């Protein structure tokens, strides 16, 4: 009986909601009202990496916090050195429709993907001296949104066909297929221990998956529209989803519910990128109104605006050592802010 | 100075990379990009067939102009999430089947798709090179089947000379940006060699119109 299954589903949802509201004994605002605020943070454009000819759609920092890859619609994956301005590699992509990239933790490989539904993995450290396509993973029935590297052999991707996939690169086959989303998955972020990872989709929900077991572990709702960015807290027991209704919502994992919402009445656009600082106090959010906003985690008042981009900021990246942040927008210039 | 020898050589390599990248951009900057956007496999495959996974790119050349047509209709995803990648395309090649008027109604579903594409945030000045598909099947299917099945309001006869003109006219009526767009409509014939000729004719007018706007004449 379909109606009996629907009744069971609604009863389970009501039980989950009642348990969540029973766990909710004190909001974050009352707990963190005693501490002093961060104050006004004014950032400076320390660098400006120019040399693209289209809109930058993603970037990622290497684990050495010096090199950063960048992808744009002209079909070029550019690996900038950020301490200087000079580039390192300029990889020509087979398909110019790229909307994601990732730098491997080892630094040996780079990745890209987009409307071609294929995750292209390029090998940087090679004897021939030129970057070659090490692998071309295919099997996604939709555009790739955000692919991130687990290690030099395993890579997790999120596609537009309501799925995520953990691939083994050498075999090239989908080792694990995470499904259960009623909407296009738009962004990805793994835990610091690289055992669990969250994916936010267009169904106004995020999901905790266990990458080793292969099944969804938790599901968080509470958004009114699509989630376009999602990033783990450095502790690994929280994350923050930036959505299309100008809201960055902080969820925590052991509470299975929302903790804070960073809503401001003066902003009506969407959020395209969300990232944390190293200690997790700050929360940078690259918005759709041509500038990023730097909010607070435990508080909610903003601490600064990273204005200076002529178009919408499309990607955010904070280094592993927390030295500086970097914003890439739809104008052809990346900018390191510190 | 204060630069080591390897730093100087790295700056030289970066300058070479910048020069090669600028050359590649200037090479792929005089080409014409045309987002082809059919409606439920109307005539898009036939259109790319008569000339010369996810996205499909078709590259052809006609009279010293390189075209790159992006057949994107094989996506089947949320169109609101990847349609901003095509902002800045030179034109949009629509494809509506005239024979699909009596088949709720597939022609009416083509009208909803055109409403969402012509009246878009990103496509506010990208002219649509609208392609009315096969008229031979429309000609044979109009002798018996009336136009009133798809069109409740039609005070005209069953002759295709004014029946097809109605469909073209009301399709152009879906534009809400008449002061910035220009919907070029063509009636495609299967044996016609003017299909690519009309695309080249409409692209040259769009390039000229985009040139006049930059100079300030228009």
């Amino acid at each position: 009986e379909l109606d009996q299954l629907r009744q069971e589903a609604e009863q389970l949802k009501n039980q989950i909601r009642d348990a969540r509201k029973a766990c909710a004994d004190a909001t974050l605002s009352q707990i963190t009202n005693n501490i002093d605020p961060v104050g006004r943070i004014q950032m400076r454009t320390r660098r400006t990496l120019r040399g693209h000819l289209a809109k930058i759609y993603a970037m990622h920092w290497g684990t050495d916090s010096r090199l950063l890859v960048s992808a744009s619609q002209d079909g070029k994956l550019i690996i900038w050195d950020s301490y200087t301005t000079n580039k390192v590699h300029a990889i020509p992509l087979r398909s110019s429709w790229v909307m994601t990239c990732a730098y491997a933790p080892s630094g040996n490989y780079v990745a890209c993907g987009g409307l071609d539904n294929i995750c292209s993995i390029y090998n940087l450290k090679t004897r021939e001296g030129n970057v070659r396509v090490s692998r071309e993973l295919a099997g996604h029935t939709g555009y790739l949104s955000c692919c991130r590297f687990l290690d030099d052999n395993q890579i997790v991707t999120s596609s537009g066909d309501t799925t995520c996939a953990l691939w083994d690169i050498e075999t090239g086959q989908q080792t694990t297929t995470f499904t259960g989303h009623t909407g296009d998955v738009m962004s990805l972020s793994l835990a610091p221990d690289t055992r669990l990872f969250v994916s936010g989709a267009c169904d106004a929900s995020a999901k905790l998956w266990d990458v080793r077991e292969g099944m969804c572990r938790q599901t968080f709702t509470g958004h009114e529209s699509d989630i376009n960015a999602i990033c783990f807290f450095p502790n690994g027991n929280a994350f923050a989803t930036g959505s299309d209704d100008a809201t960055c919502r902080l969820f925590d994992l052991r509470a299975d519910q929302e903790l804070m919402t960073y809503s401001h009445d003066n902003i009506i656009c969407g959020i395209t990128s969300v990232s944390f600082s190293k200690s997790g106090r700050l929360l940078l959010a690259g918005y759709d109104d041509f500038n990023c906003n730097v909010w607070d985690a435990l508080k909610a008042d903003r601490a600064g605006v990273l204005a200076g981009h002529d178009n919408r900021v499309s990607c955010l990246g904070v280094t592993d050592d927390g030295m500086a942040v970097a914003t890439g927008s739809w104008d052809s210039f990346l900018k390191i802010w510190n | 100075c204060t630069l080591s020898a390897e730093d100087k050589a790295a700056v030289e390599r970066s300058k070479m990379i910048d020069r090669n990248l600028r050359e590649d951009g200037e090479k792929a900057a005089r080409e014409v990009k045309l987002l082809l956007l059919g409606a439920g496999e109307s005539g898009k495959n036939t259109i790319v067939k008569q000339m010369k996974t996810g996205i499909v790119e078709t590259h052809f050349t006609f009279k010293d102009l390189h075209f790159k047509m992006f057949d994107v209709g094989a996506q089947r995803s949320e169109r609101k999430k990847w349609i901003h990648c095509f902002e800045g395309v030179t034109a949009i090649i629509f494809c509506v089947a005239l024979s699909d008027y009596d088949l709720m109604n597939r022609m009416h579903e083509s009208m909803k798709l055109f409403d969402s594409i012509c009246n878009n945030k990103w496509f506010t000045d990208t002219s649509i090179i609208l392609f009315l598909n096969k008229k031979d099947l429309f000609e044979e299917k109009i002798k018996k089947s009336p136009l009133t099945i798809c069109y409740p309001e039609y005070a005209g006869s069953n002759t295709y000379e004014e029946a097809a003109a109605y469909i073209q006219c009301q399709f152009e009526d879906l534009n809400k940006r008449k002061d910035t767009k220009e919907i070029y409509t063509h009636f495609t014939c299967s044996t016609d060699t003017k299909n690519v000729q009309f695309v080249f004719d409409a692209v040259t007018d769009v390039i000229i119109k985009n040139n006049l706007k930059d100079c300030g004449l228009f």
Partner: single-chain antibody
Amino acid sequence: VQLVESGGGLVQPGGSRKLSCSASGFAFSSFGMHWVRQAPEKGLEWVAYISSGSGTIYYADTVKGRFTISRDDPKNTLFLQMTSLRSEDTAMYYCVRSIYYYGSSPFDFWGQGTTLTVSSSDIVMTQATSSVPVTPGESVSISCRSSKSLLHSNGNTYLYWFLQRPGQSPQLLIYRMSNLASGVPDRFSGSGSGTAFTLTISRLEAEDVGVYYCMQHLEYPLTFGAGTKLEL
């Protein structure tokens, strides 16, 4: 990846000759090239360098004026045209690739080389030892002393270590002060500070016999090191 050389042989003094490097197996257009000579009884000595795309060019002061260099990227060849040869040019000329970016390993591959015979303000780097007889299984430390501190404001001290086995081309062992070159075992290591530098080998075997050379790269590598020979 392979580099070969053509030319050389016996030539009269005051004449002319051309040396060709043919490179097969890598992107030749993105690699800077060096010519480095070695006397039949002495160590390696720098001769010339041409960057990628021939944007910059550098010569040794001992040959500056009578030697010229060029590269042919479509025909992937490297030309060295030598005129007015003297008695000091009897040498084997290794042809070396080197690519410069962040984290790169220059001088990674050395060519075979052809011998040429005739008829009759530099950062000098000094090596103390010249013949250290060490049995396999022990630890070998090789020290190199320069003229100035090789550490730059960038934080990396530009010094390279090379090993030449008896009979064939030298190989890069340690690049830029203990960054291990790809393909060598993990037994080798580097250390030092300022102008004093050491190379460490925890375990050595029979095929680790040869002559160890240093190198500077703070200024252009106009200098080398009189190599230290390891024997059993």
